[PDB]
Amino acid sequence: ELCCLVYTSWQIPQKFIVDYSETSPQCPKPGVILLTKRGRQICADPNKKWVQKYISDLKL
Amino acid sequence: SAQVGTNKELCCLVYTSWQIPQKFIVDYSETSPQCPKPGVILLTKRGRQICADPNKKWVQKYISDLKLN
């Protein structure tokens, strides 16, 4: 059910991101949800290199 | 609004089940064109949201009464 419609243009500083979630493949759009230290859940574009770079390291 | 850019924040997934008393609504806003179903977000004075179906007569009436004054 949970999906992204608008992606953030804010390249959230990596150390302000505590985790991320991927959205269902049934969503019309692909999306990852970034969770910030302030507890916001912010949709971001997985086709964006900066988002991909954060995910690659956030896994470590 | 913990959520930013998601359907749950930009769409009406479930309308109010009942007609709201008119005194509560002072404004409204549109939902995303990407939403699977129609919806308008009605706004209370406290800045709080109630999702509603634009196809309802009372919804159109409420909005019209606000705009025409």
Curated annotation (Swiss-Prot), chain A:
Disulfide bonds join C3-C27, C4-C43. This is CCL18(4-69). It comes from Homo sapiens.
